[PDB]
From a paper:
Here we report a functional and structural genomics effort that applied saturation-level transposon mutagenesis and next generation sequencing (Tn-seq) to identify essential genes in B. thailandensis, followed by high-throughput structure determination. We used an “ortholog rescue” approach to maximize structural coverage of these gene families, which are likely to be essential not only in B. thailandensis, but also in related, but more virulent, Burkholderia species, such as [name]. Using only seven Burkholderia species to select orthologs of essential genes, we solved structures for 49/406 essential gene families, and for 56 total Burkholderia protein targets (including seven ortholog replicates). Of these 56 targets, 25 satisfied criteria for being a potential antimicrobial drug target.
One strategy that has been employed to improve success rates is to “rescue” such proteins by adding orthologs from related species to the pipeline, based on the assumptions that many of these will have slightly different physical properties that may improve their solubility or crystallization, and that close orthologs will have structures sufficiently similar to the original target to be useful as surrogates in drug design. By using an ortholog rescue strategy for insoluble or difficult to crystallize targets, we increased our structural coverage of B. thailandensis essential genes from 31/406 (7.6%) to 49/406 (12.1%).
Numbering used by the authors: 0 to 306
């Protein structure tokens, strides 16, 4: 049977999340490689935090790439087969590209640090943010945003599961969209503790910086199919992969569609590779015939080896 690996992004991290892998030689070597690339002790940052350091986005993005990739390398060290198709959620798309051999891990490290810096400084402080809307289908959330937009730009920017949508834009747009969403019967419509309007058109300046940065990155044709967040496309051309990463930052993460794409390829097993269990839960919601597992410690890895 064919399987997919999906890789998590920001928001899946926690202090101590790799403790259970502390004595797996490849996890140690991956944390060493990350520290060498970034100039700080990534192992201890993850193990000890504090959470306020671990949650700075300039740390969170390389931390989540490292932790999830560590988990991929442990899967291999254990003799796990290559998945037939991969994807990842926002930052996680980078990890997927690394697993697929498109971007060397050593290159991916300063790339995602830079991406974090770019995305955090694209718009002036306090201009915008993000919110989570629960209970409304995608087209209703789009209608909510189109209506709210008279008060400021606001867009539906993460399609995560049925009835689970994140929006992003101006502070005013986000507030009005929550209010409208509630009126239309949303189970929940609440601002997220995020300081920048990620995956909105307001983030175009981040895309522009990413384009300049990726110009100098050696991207290779993947050895595993990667389905991208922005277009739900599987592309092999290095230039196209780069462009999908550029547009990704200021465009919608079509996560539901990526999972459905994977399913239409005849994959029935979808394994979340990395900590936090976020993607595991979304797979269940997107398509209950899919069979989930997760690799985040040695025990879960062995159960995933079975599936």
């Amino acid at each position: 049977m064919k399987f997919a690996f999906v890789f998590p992004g920001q928001g899946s991290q926690s202090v101590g999340m790799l403790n259970a892998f502390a004595d797996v030689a490849v996890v140690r070597e991956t944390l060493d490689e990350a520290s060498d690339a970034l100039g700080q002790d990534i192992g201890k940052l993850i193990a000890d935090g504090p959470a306020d350091e671990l949650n700075l986005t300039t740390n969170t993005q390389p931390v989540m790439l490292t932790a999830a990739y560590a988990c991929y390398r442990a899967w291999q060290q254990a003799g796990g087969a290559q998945p037939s198709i991969v994807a990842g959620h926002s930052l996680g798309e980078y990890t997927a590209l690394v697993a697929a051999g498109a971007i060397a891990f050593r290159d991916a490290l300063p790339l995602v640090r830079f991406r974090a810096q770019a995305m955090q400084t694209a718009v002036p402080v306090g201009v915008g943010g993000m919110a989570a809307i629960l209970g409304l289908d995608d087209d209703t959330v789009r209608a909510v945003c189109a209506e709210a937009s008279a008060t400021g730009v606001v867009e539906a920017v993460n399609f995560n599961a049925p009835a689970q949508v994140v929006i992003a834009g101006t502070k005013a747009g986000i507030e009005k969209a929550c209010e409208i969403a509630k009126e239309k019967g949303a189970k929940r419509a609440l601002p997220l503790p995020v300081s920048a309007p990620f995956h909105s058109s307001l983030l175009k300046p981040a895309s522009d910086k990413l384009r300049e940065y990726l110009a100098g990155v050696d991207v290779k044709a993947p050895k595993i199919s990667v389905v991208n967040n922005i277009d739900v496309a599987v592309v092999s051309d290095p230039a196209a992969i780069k462009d999908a990463l550029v547009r990704q930052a200021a465009g919608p993460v079509r996560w539901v569609e990526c999972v459905q794409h994977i399913a239409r390829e005849g994959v029935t097993h979808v394994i979340e590779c990395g900590p936090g269990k976020v993607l595991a839960g979304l797979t269940k919601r997107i398509d209950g015939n899919l069979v989930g597992a997760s690799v985040f410690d040695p025990a879960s890895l062995d159960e995933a080896l079975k599936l």
